[PDB]
């Protein structure tokens, strides 16, 4: 595919494939050109070299790429390793309907609720907002609802408060050691840009308010909304599974 400025961005798989094709063609041309053995036997070995470097580059001689000195990535290299497929693709992927922010205090909050910034909720629940607006006779069609929320009309704030109502969300702390690293809370719309967190849970999350950031995740299916209320909700996880001692104990 092309890119900005006109430069084209290609994959190393291409370079390697092109090499295999060039050398196979050259060999056939020799086989029909009546060449000696010292030439054709060199071509066969070059072909084997190119093919093996195309399947797995780094087991024969590490065929480098073009203008760049770095060795090009072969087929098998696009599967294994912590980076790439199977580890950074199929077990862990990025997800829509999510976000992150710097977290703060929030004592007034209950052990089950958390303060979620308003604009974050707007952007997150955009798909819910559009439909719930076009349903209540406030937006002609989906496109009109988009412009209504894009203009920040007053009615859409109350609409957002109607969609949040009992719709649990998921909060995650960056290193996830135990299962409590992800816990479901009940959204509490708030002004500003900071995420309010309940102090009693700071122990379980193992987080401070020195600049730590947390990520939010919005469930979609009615199931994921129930599992966030009867399985992941904060007030359902009190005593740790590792040891019967409660994970919810007063801090400083």
């Amino acid at each position: 595919v092309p890119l900005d400025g006109g430069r084209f961005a290609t994959s190393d798989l291409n370079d390697l494939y092109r090499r295999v094709i060039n050398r196979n063609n050259r060999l056939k041309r020799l086989l029909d050109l009546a060449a000696p053995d010292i030439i054709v036997r060199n071509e066969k070995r070059m072909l084997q070299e190119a093919v093996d470097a195309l399947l797995d580059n780094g087991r024969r001689g590490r065929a480098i790429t073009g203008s760049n000195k770095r060795p090009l990535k072969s087929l098998a290299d696009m599967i294994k390793g912590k980076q790439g497929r199977f580890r950074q693709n199929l077990l862990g992927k990025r997800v829509d309907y999510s976000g992150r922010s710097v977290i703060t205090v929030g004592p007034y909050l209950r052990l089950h609720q958390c303060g979620l910034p308003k604009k974050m909720a707007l952007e997150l629940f955009k798909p819910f907002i559009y439909g719930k607006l076009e349903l209540r006779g406030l937006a002609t069609t989906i496109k009109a609802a988009k412009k209504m929320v894009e203009r920040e009309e007053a009615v859409v704030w109350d609409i957002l408060d109607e969609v949040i109502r009992e719709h649990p969300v998921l909060l995650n702390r960056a290193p996830t050691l135990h299962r409590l690293g992800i816990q479901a809370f009940e959204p509490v719309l708030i002004e500003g840009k900071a995420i309010q967190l309940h102090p009693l849970v700071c122990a379980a999350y193992n987080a401070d308010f020195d600049g730590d950031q947390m990520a939010v995740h919005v469930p979609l299916t009615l199931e994921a909304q129930l599992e966030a209320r009867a399985l992941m909700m904060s007030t359902n996880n009190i005593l740790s599974p590792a040891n019967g001692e409660p994970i919810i104990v007063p801090s400083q």
Binding site: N42, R45, M46, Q48, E49, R60, G61
Partner: peptide, 10 residues
């Protein structure tokens, strides 16, 4: 050596 360039160079 291993590399097939050595097979040819010699």
């Amino acid at each position: 050596t291993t590399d097939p360039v050595r097979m040819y160079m010699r």
